[PDB]
Amino acid sequence: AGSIPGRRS
Amino acid sequence: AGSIPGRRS
Amino acid sequence: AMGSMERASLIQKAKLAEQAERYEDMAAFMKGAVEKGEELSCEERNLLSVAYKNVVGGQRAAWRVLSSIEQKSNEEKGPEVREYREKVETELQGVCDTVLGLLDSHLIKEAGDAESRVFYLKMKGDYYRYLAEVATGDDKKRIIDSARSAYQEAMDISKKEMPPTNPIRLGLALNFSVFHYEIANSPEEAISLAKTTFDEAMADLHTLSEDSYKDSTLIMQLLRDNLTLWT
Amino acid sequence: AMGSMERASLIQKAKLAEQAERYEDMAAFMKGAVEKGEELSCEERNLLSVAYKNVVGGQRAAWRVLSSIEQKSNEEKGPEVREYREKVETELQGVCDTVLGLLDSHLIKEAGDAESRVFYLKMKGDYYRYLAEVATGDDKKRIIDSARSAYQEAMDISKKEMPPTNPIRLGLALNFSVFHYEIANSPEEAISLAKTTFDEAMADLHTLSEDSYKDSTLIMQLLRDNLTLWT
Ligand SMILES: *Cc1ccc([N+](=O)[O-])c(N2CCC(O)CC2)c1
Ligand SMILES: *Cc1ccc([N+](=O)[O-])c(N2CCC(O)CC2)c1
């Protein structure tokens, strides 16, 4: 399913 | 303001 | 760089790159297709424009972010914001010069039908306009004149050869109005052009099929959106 | 390529590139910073990870689009979809090899504190996992083993040295569970690990400040989201 996403910027 | 946008894909 | 690949394979890979949102690849494939030396079909012209619009769109967005930071800084932040803004700016200028070079060698000179010639001259105006967005001083003046001249030739052809609802004619007028408002410090000319373009298209909608009506009214809404922001 | 730029300038330009969403630039700046040979601080490690996660994320998304098209094709569509999928795949593999090479020369060997060593070993597992997503056959087996070994060493350190709510420990367990589910064909191990990680973090939340509680519960929600999809 989902791994850790990158932080937004 | 806004020019023609590119089409989406 | 694409000289060993078949024209038809470059076009197919450009379509795949669009689906994959790989717009730098898409632009390289379409540059290779143009450099085969044959004229481009309607859909191939659209692929060329979409590819470069996305590449230069990312660069313009980044340049605006960096320019805003640089303007805020002028505590001593060091040369880094300016240096990096300059790097992005040079890359953007290189993409614009590449597109302009394709148009000059030899897309425009071989374009005889109104649909192709207007499309390419509008692109020429657009890419000089993107150069003008980052230019300063006297350089800015000549770049602005080059954008204006390309748009004006496209306008003259479009008014003689295309109905007022033609989507290319409408998009040309939209972008030339943005040029007047944002680049040439002529907001009244921008508003006049957008209003007249909208009104003349409205009066021609009755001639269109359902599908053409949808295409034309979509661009008319963009003219109206700009008029709402400008008035 | 960045050897002439100051370490501090590379770090500042990486932060600017993040703001400008120029992630390829960001990754090049952070590679240059790593190659200065000094250890990375907590925030510099985050910059390195964000940069490469975005680069390889775009490649993975494109590879999935192209792989799906290729699978649909197998009318004769010619070699183009396969050729272009292979091009993207090779580029993705090159980025993963670059990241793995930075970790091996010499980030992991110099990382003695648990926070740095676990972070780098989790990255090692992640980039072998991205290699495994595109690998076939016996190559896939050794790549899978390399991902598993990196994640397992990180898990062993994290369980000895970090509280069960530590965000790096939580994200490691999340990604190792995804490895089990998506790569290693071990959905039961994935579910067990996600459940045990969630439950042990829940029991430790009472020790945390408001800000740490927010950080830990955000990742716990990701574990719960996966458990909802898997059960
Ligand atoms: C693998 C992992 C686990 C936790 C966190 N975190 O809580 O910050 C991260 N970072 C996310 C923010 C940034 O993208 C760097 C990595 C990563
Ligand atoms: C400049 C302009 C005007 C109209 C249209 N159009 O109605 O298609 C376009 N295209 C938009 C779709 C694609 O991005 C190519 C250009 C452009």
CB < 8 Å & 24+ apart, contacts of C35-38? C35/C2, C35/C3, C35/C102, C36/C7, C36/C10, C37/C106, C38/C7
Question: Helix and strand tally (H, E) in chain A?
Answer: 0, 0
CB C60 within 8 A of CB C130: yes
Q: Does A8 touch chain D (CB under 8 A)?
A: no
Contact present, C173 and C193 (Cβ < 8 Å): yes
Any domain includes D208: yes
Instruction: Note whether residue D2 is domain-resident.
Output: no
Technique used? X-ray
Per DSSP, the residues of C99-137 read HHHHIIIIIHHH--SHHHHHHHHHHHHHHHHHHHHH--H
Which residue reads 């946008």 in tokens? B5
Give the contacts of C13 (CB within 8 A, at least 6 positions apart). Answer: C5, C25, C29, D80, D83, D84
**Does C138 reside within a domain?**
yes
In a domain, C74, yes or no: yes
Alpha-carbon gap: A8 to the closest alpha carbon of chain D (Å): 9
Residues of D whose CB is below 8 A from C58: 21
- Asked if the structure places residue D182 within a domain, the reply is yes
Report which ligand 2 atom has the smallest distance to the Cα of C175.
1
Q: State which amino acid sits at residue D102.
A: L
The alpha carbon of C157 and the centre of ligand 2 are apart by a number of angstroms equal to: 18
Count structural domains, chain D. 1
CATH number for position D27: 1.20.190.20
Q: Nominal resolution in Å?
A: 1.4
C-beta separation of D132 from D183 below 8 A: yes
For residue C200, tell me if it sits in a domain. Answer: yes
- CA–CA separation, C109 vs D196, rounded Å? 69
Cα separation, D156 vs D133, whole angstroms: 24
3-state helix, strand, coil in chain B (%, to 5): 0, 0, 100
| Domain enclosing residue D154, as ranges | 7-231
Residues whose CB falls within 8 Å of the CB of residue C110, separated by 6 or more in sequence, listed in order: C39
**A neighbour chains, 3+ CB pairs within 8 Å:** D
What Å distances lie between residue C15 and D55, D69, D89, D190, CA to CA?
Answer: 22, 12, 18, 38
Residue C2 within a domain = no
Ligand nearest to the CA of C215: 2
Alpha helices in chain D (DSSP H): 7-19, 23-34, 42-73, 80-102, 108-110, 114-134, 137-161, 167-178, 187-202, 210-230
CA distance D87 to C170: 39
Q: Which two tokens stand for residue D187?
A: 């959905």
Q: Report residues whose beta carbon is within 6 angstroms of any ligand 1 atom.
A: A 4, 6-7; D 46, 49-50, 122, 167-168, 171, 215, 219
Return the biggest CA–CA distance within chain D: 62
Chain D environment of A4 (Cβ under 8 Å): 171, 174-175, 219, 222
Distances, alpha carbon D43 to alpha carbons D17, D46, D210, in Å = 15, 5, 21
Q: Is residue C1 part of a domain?
A: no
